[PDB]
Design a protein around this motif. Structure first.
Motif, short mmCIF file in Angstrom:
data_model
loop_
_atom_site.label_atom_id
_atom_site.label_comp_id
_atom_site.label_asym_id
_atom_site.label_seq_id
_atom_site.Cartn_x
_atom_site.Cartn_y
_atom_site.Cartn_z
N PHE A 146 -7.13 -29.68 20.91
CA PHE A 146 -8.39 -30.38 21.17
C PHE A 146 -9.39 -29.46 21.86
CE2 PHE A 146 -11.12 -33.47 23.43
CZ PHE A 146 -11.58 -34.15 22.33
N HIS A 162 -16.37 -27.98 16.60
CA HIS A 162 -17.41 -29.01 16.60
C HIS A 162 -18.18 -29.02 17.92
CE1 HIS A 162 -15.39 -31.61 13.23
NE2 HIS A 162 -15.76 -30.42 12.81
N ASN A 163 -18.61 -27.85 18.38
CA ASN A 163 -19.34 -27.75 19.63
C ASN A 163 -20.76 -28.29 19.44
OD1 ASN A 163 -19.22 -27.17 22.32
ND2 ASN A 163 -19.51 -24.96 22.11
N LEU A 164 -21.12 -29.30 20.23
CA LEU A 164 -22.47 -29.84 20.15
C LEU A 164 -23.51 -28.79 20.54
CD1 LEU A 164 -23.73 -30.77 23.26
CD2 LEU A 164 -21.73 -32.25 23.06
N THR A 220 -13.03 -28.58 20.28
CA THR A 220 -14.28 -28.90 20.95
C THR A 220 -14.98 -27.67 21.53
OG1 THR A 220 -13.10 -29.41 23.00
CG2 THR A 220 -13.54 -31.22 21.48
N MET A 246 -15.39 -38.94 26.53
CA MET A 246 -15.58 -37.52 26.22
C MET A 246 -14.26 -36.77 26.19
SD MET A 246 -18.67 -37.13 25.50
CE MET A 246 -18.86 -35.35 25.54
N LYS A 285 -12.19 -38.25 22.81
CA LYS A 285 -12.76 -38.19 21.47
C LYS A 285 -13.69 -36.99 21.35
CE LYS A 285 -14.17 -41.88 19.34
NZ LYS A 285 -14.92 -43.14 19.06
N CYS A 286 -13.86 -36.53 20.11
CA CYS A 286 -14.81 -35.48 19.81
C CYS A 286 -16.19 -36.09 19.58
CB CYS A 286 -14.38 -34.68 18.58
SG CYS A 286 -15.34 -33.18 18.30
N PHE A 287 -17.21 -35.44 20.12
CA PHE A 287 -18.56 -35.99 20.05
C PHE A 287 -19.07 -36.05 18.62
CE2 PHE A 287 -23.20 -35.91 20.68
CZ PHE A 287 -23.32 -36.99 21.53
N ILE A 288 -18.78 -35.03 17.81
CA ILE A 288 -19.39 -34.94 16.49
C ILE A 288 -18.65 -35.81 15.48
CG2 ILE A 288 -20.14 -33.36 14.68
CD1 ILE A 288 -21.60 -33.08 17.35
#
Ligand SMILES: Nc1ncnc2c1ncn2[C@@H]1O[C@@H]2COP(=O)(O)O[C@H]2[C@H]1O
Ligand SMILES: Nc1ncnc2c1ncn2[C@@H]1O[C@@H]2COP(=O)(O)O[C@H]2[C@H]1O
Ligand SMILES: [Zn+2]
Ligand SMILES: [Zn+2]
Lengths: 517, 266
Positions: A455, A463-465, A459, A434, A437-440
């Motif tokens: 970063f 690219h916020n989940l 995040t 986590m 790397k970026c989740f998306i």
């Protein structure tokens, strides 16, 4: 603050940016601690066992479950048939809100009851053997009865609160997987799962019901299944299977049975039912309330983590116990044939107590005594000095002590310790993945760290989940007509369940490097 | 300034080290009442010796889990006690004399105390310390009782404690190694990896000893503090004001002199 921001790959095959308004109620429900716990568990689970092919599917499923949980929370949030109904709904919402407090109350009541039980005494004479409480104050005797009744009531209310709080999520889930398997895979139209799939065989009772989806949002699943599969597999037969009248298109005991059969296979519901059963049995025999002390393992997160070390290598622990049994059996077959004279466990010379004249007795003696002995069976059988089989006996005893007492118990020790280490390494690996790397999009932090806090900016804003979940919720609440072009594109593409609008390996910066520079 | 003095003294009396020294003084005073109170000062070896502190950090790293597993041991032994007090009361006679029995499980409190005290310290569990079950109708139940006690309590839970301590050792070692590796492979100020600076021979060493030395940054902060406001040069005054506003953007984040003037330095 109120402004959401997500990035998708649009129809032009380019990363775009979408801005939308996020509801404060939805934001608060997302920041709620139980939702945060669910999100953390989801992240840990996918990072442990997930692949890029299924990562987005699992993410969207988790988002759907979270949205339904938010709907349930909003529903149960606190603001002669009519008065009865309003009082009943108020009471049920109260139980759903206070489920966890009731669980903690049940734990506290179990501790109180067992602490009172620490005062029982047995006597031949009345206060045949009688059990009674012997304490000075005299208040424990009625306190125990009051607390036992209160604990039974609290367990019943816990069952009701579970039925009204966490059963709907299970039903919504099962309905959504059934709908997806029916309308994408044609599980019943084409696949026809066999008797091995007990869930599939039980799910037949709901397909023809008037309301097959009752918690699942997609209420047009029957229409979708008809359009997709009837034209090729018999429209009449599809309608008969799904229990929908074709003529009705132009112009629930069975479902209740299905839902109850689904609930009775729920592990948490079964645990609460067992809790209630032992609460009822406590009034027959108060010491049955001791079985509720096992609830500490279910409740305390620290205890769950500690016992996860034992259960992580549980299969290997069972296997090494079986190996211990086999090895002790081999030592028993050697003893019963060569060392029978050394197994006299009677001090009296008149009557012997040979513990190895029977094979069953010798095996029981070995397993019971020589495994619990510090130095093995050599502590517990006769001394071999001054005998013709002395060296054979010392080899027997020393190999028993080495292989059984030392090696196998060492295997158990190491299994537990390695479970500790493996769980710690799993947590560290999830955290590192986590962080790096970026989740998306999966782009590493080394690229985004070109700019200061790049970063973190990516995040938290790009690219916020949580932002993607909020966007899914926003699309769901929005009407079909009001959709903008990008919203309608992603809405239709989600209805088809194609997870390619999630930016895979590309981002706004990686696209417009030159134009942003 | 009596009020300020009261505030400062209330702050000092909440200091852990000051409270430890006060307790040291208190036991020193109590030593004159009873010389054996001076034995409480041998606990100071743990406070003093760095090696002892490191060794005891293994015990205290998983201290919460150790307390939790002790509580779990207590609960499990209580369950074995509730089973014993109901089914195996006859086996708990701890008197050699036949005339007067010493039943250790006719009371629930007594049976729990017997279990916790004796069966947990016994090598094979409570089966060493209670009557032999051979030649009895409950023999198989008793052997299952004893063997499960020995497995879950003597083996599994003590193994849990062993593993908690060992895993604490390993985790602390891994933490030290990770800190060392991070310092070796990244620059503290800018975060640029050593792989970039190692283009030239000893480039990372030159960068971390001459370009972005954290000691140098501390020295610069001290130099600004000692210097008068008027004597500041332009860059000194810029960084001084920007520090007075507590904006830490003058620290080079992700950029360095080499990464800036690559072409002009080449
Ligand atoms: N798409 C993402 N959304 C949110 N957090 C992410 C994402 N990808 C990686 N992360 C990391 O996961 C962390 C979880 O919450 P943090 O506030 O610690 O900061 C987050 C980031 O470091
Ligand atoms: N900004 C920095 N200042 C000093 N040392 C650093 C810095 N960044 C990384 N280091 C590393 O940390 C080490 C600590 O002291 P060394 O003399 O071992 O060499 C140092 C470098 O390898
Ligand atoms: Zn991303
Ligand atoms: Zn640097």
């Amino acid at each position: 603050p109120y402004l959401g921001r997500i990035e998708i790959m649009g129809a032009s095959r380019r990363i775009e940016r979408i801005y939308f308004e996020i509801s404060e109620t939805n934001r608060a429900q997302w920041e709620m601690p139980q939702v945060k716990e669910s999100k953390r568990q989801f992240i840990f689970d996918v990072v442990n066992e997930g692949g890029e092919a299924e990562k987005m599917e699992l993410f969207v499923s988790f988002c759907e479950d979270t949205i339904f949980e938010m709907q349930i929370a909003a529903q149960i949030s606190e603001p002669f048939w009519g008065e009865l109904e309003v009082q009943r709904v108020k009471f049920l919402n109260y139980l759903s809100r206070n489920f966890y407090t009731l669980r903690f109350l049940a734990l506290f009541l179990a501790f109180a009851i067992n602490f009172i039980l620490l005062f029982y005494k047995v006597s031949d004479s009345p206060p045949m053997v009688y059990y009674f409480l012997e304490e000075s104050t005299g208040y424990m005797e009625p306190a125990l009865w009051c607390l036992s009744l209160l604990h039974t009531l609290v367990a019943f209310l816990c069952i009701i609160g579970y039925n009204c709080l966490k059963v709907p999520l299970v039903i919504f889930k099962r309905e959504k997987e059934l709908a997806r398997k029916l309308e994408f895979d044609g599980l019943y139209i084409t696949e026809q799962p066999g008797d091995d799939d007990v869930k599939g065989q039980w799910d037949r009772l709901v397909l023809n019901t008037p309301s097959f989806p009752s918690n699942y949002w997609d209420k047009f699943v029957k229409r979708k299944v008809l359009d997709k599969h009837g034209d090729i597999f018999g429209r009449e037969r599809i309608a008969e299977l799904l229990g929908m009248d074709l003529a009705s298109l132009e112009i629930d005991v069975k479902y209740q049975i299905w839902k109850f059969g689904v609930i009775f296979t729920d592990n948490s519901f079964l645990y609460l039912g067992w809790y209630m059963v032992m609460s009822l049995l406590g009034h027959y025999n108060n010491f049955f309330f001791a079985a509720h002390l096992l609830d500490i393992a279910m409740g305390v997160k620290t205890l769950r983590t500690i016992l996860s070390s034992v259960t992580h290598n549980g299969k290997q622990l069972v296997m090494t116990v079986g190996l211990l049994a086999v090895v002790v059996y081999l030592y028993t077959v050697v003893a019963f044939n060569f060392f029978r004279k050394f197994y006299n466990k009677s001090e009296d010379e008149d009557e012997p107590d040979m513990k190895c004249d029977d094979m069953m007795t010798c095996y029981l003696f070995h397993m019971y005594v020589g495994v619990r002995a510090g130095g093995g069976i050599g502590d517990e059988i006769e001394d071999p000095a001054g005998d013709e089989y002395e060296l054979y006996r010392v080899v027997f005893d020393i190999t028993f002590f080495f292989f059984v007492i030392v090696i196998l118990l060492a295997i158990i020790q190491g299994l537990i310790i390695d479970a500790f280490g493996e769980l710690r390494d799993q947590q560290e690996q999830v955290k590192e993945d986590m962080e790096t790397k970026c989740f998306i999009c999966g782009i590493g932090s080394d690229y985004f760290d070109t700019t200061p806090h790049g970063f973190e900016t990516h995040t938290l804003e790009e690219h916020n989940l949580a932002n993607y979940m909020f966007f899914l919720m926003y699309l769901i609440n929005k009407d079909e007509t009001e959709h903008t072009g990008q919203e309608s594109y992603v809405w239709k593409m989600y209805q088809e369940r194609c997870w390619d609008f999630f930016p895979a390996g590309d981002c706004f910066r990686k696209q417009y490097e030159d134009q942003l520079s």
